[PDB]
Amino acid sequence: EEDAGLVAEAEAVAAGWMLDFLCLSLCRAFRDGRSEDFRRTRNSAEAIIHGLSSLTACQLRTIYICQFLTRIAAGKTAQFENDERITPLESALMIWGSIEKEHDKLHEEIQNLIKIQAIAVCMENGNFKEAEEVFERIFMPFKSKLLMIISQKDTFHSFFQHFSYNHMMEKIKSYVNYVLSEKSSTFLMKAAAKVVESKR
Amino acid sequence: EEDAGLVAEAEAVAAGWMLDFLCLSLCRAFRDGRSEDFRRTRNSAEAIIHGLSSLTACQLRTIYICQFLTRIAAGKTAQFENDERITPLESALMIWGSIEKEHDKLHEEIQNLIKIQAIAVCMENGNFKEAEEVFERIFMPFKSKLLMIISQKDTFHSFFQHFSYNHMMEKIKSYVNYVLSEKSSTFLMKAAAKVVESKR
Numbered sequence: 249e250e251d252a253g254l255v256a257e258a259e260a261v262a263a264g265w266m267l268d269f270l271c272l273s274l275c276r277a278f279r280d281g282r283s284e285d286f287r288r289t290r291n292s293a294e295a296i297i298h299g300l301s302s303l304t305a306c307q308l309r310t311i312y313i314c315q316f317l318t319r320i321a322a323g324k325t326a327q328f329e330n331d332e333r334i335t336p337l338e339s340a341l342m343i344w345g346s347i348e349k350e351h352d353k354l355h356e357e358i359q360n361l362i363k364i365q366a367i368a369v370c371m372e373n374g375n376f377k378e379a380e381e382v383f384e385r386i387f388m389p390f391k392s393k394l395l396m397i398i399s400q401k402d403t404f405h406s407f408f409q410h411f412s413y414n415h416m417m418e419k420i421k422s423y424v425n426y427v428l429s430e431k432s433s434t435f436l437m438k439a440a441a442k443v444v445e446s447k448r
Numbered sequence: 449e450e451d452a453g454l455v456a457e458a459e460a461v462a463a464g465w466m467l468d469f470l471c472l473s474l475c476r477a478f479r480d481g482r483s484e485d486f487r488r489t490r491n492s493a494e495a496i497i498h499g500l501s502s503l504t505a506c507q508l509r510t511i512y513i514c515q516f517l518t519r520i521a522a523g524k525t526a527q528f529e530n531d532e533r534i535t536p537l538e539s540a541l542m543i544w545g546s547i548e549k550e551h552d553k554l555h556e557e558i559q560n561l562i563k564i565q566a567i568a569v570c571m572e573n574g575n576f577k578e579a580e581e582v583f584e585r586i587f588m589p590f591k592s593k594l595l596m597i598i599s600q601k602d603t604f605h606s607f608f609q610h611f612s613y614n615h616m617m618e619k620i621k622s623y624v625n626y627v628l629s630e631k632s633s634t635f636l637m638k639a640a641a642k643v644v645e646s647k648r
């Protein structure tokens with residue numbers, strides 16, 4: 249009586265719904281600074297994504313936005329540096345430059361803040377040899393200036409204050425706001441909101 | 449403009465929907481013998497359950513059915529025996545006897561098949577000292593007979609053939625069929641099936 253292929257198709261539809269809902273919830277937690285909520289939603293989304301073997305262009309964009317935000321959230325934080333041999337912010341830079349999206353003023357701004365902050369977070373943590381290793385992997389007159397700053401442990405140089413962590417976060421949060429509005433009307437959240445508003 | 453408490457409430461409604469959907473999908477995979485699908489759905493449900501801090505009586509019953517099926521699936525399979533210091537089937541027996549459900553003929557049948565199979569799976573794996581340790585933790589004249597069988601490595605005794613692994617699995621699958629029918633109409637699966645049927 250039950251068609252296994254049609255049941256599997258229903259599960260793939262629901263998986264797609266859960267992925268969109270979890271991306272919106274991950275975006276909100278990132279915007280709100282709710283770290284534990286972000287960590288729990290990330291774990292849920294990673295597990296749901298594991299239940300999918302074929303993804304559409306839209307779904308690939310959704311999982312790469314989640315991966316990007318995950319690296320950014322881990323920015324100032326071992327096994328990753330053994331698995332990928334790079335820093336979270338360098339990994340975020342790789343995802344950022346490969347997501348199927350427009351390379352507008354905001355994309356270039358976020359990209360440049362990530363490139364500088366990938367060096368600055370190492371200096372903030374006192375690992376200046378790592379800061380030089382990050383610089384060499386990423387990266388004129390300007391390049392020489394940046395290397396001198398790293399070399400002179402000039403963590404609070406006016407350049408790092410302009411291309412700061414807070415500025416990187418504000419620019420990323422601005423991008424997240426577009427994604428948040430784009431997925432604010434997905435099936436799961438739209439149906440869940442209706443239940444809440446009905447109570448009442 | 450956005451109420452954080454109402455948004456959090458929508459997320460808790462959706463979490464409840466995802467939990468019910470994932471339990472139904474875990475039940476189907478267990479009934480069908482789709483091990484990799486069961487493992488993926490279990491990982492997804494464990495992650496979603498982590499996003500919930502308050503559970504209703506119905507939701508507690510749902511997570512305990514998932515926990516029970518997980519132990520049963522791990523029945524013939526180290527860290528668990530260091531974390532809980534017991535075997536999966538003994539852990540399943542503990543969940544089974546504490547789920548808020550009726551202790552009918554089927555419940556007693558499944559309970560007794562689990563009690564015997566917890567000893568038999570150790571003998572099947574060649575760990576007869578473990579079989580005696582399991583027997584001592586769980587547990588006349590009958591008890592002496594069972595200890596003699598274990599002691600004489602009589603794995604294929606007529607008793608173990610009547611209280612077999614296959615019989616345990618068939619009785620558990622029979623119980624799963626009631627749960628499967630109970631949750632076959634949950635919001636997520638009902639809405640997902642409608643999408644599939646609309647395409648056709």
Ligand SMILES: CCC(=O)Nc1nc(C)cs1
Nearest residue numbers: 290293294297314315318
């Ligand atoms: C390496 C795989 C990975 O990072 N996956 C992630 N998916 C989400 C949803 C966050 S991180």
Ligand SMILES: CCC(=O)Nc1nc(C)cs1
Nearest residue numbers: 490493494497514515518
């Ligand atoms: C020990 C916790 C645990 O086993 N949780 C599980 N939840 C599911 C959904 C399967 S196993």
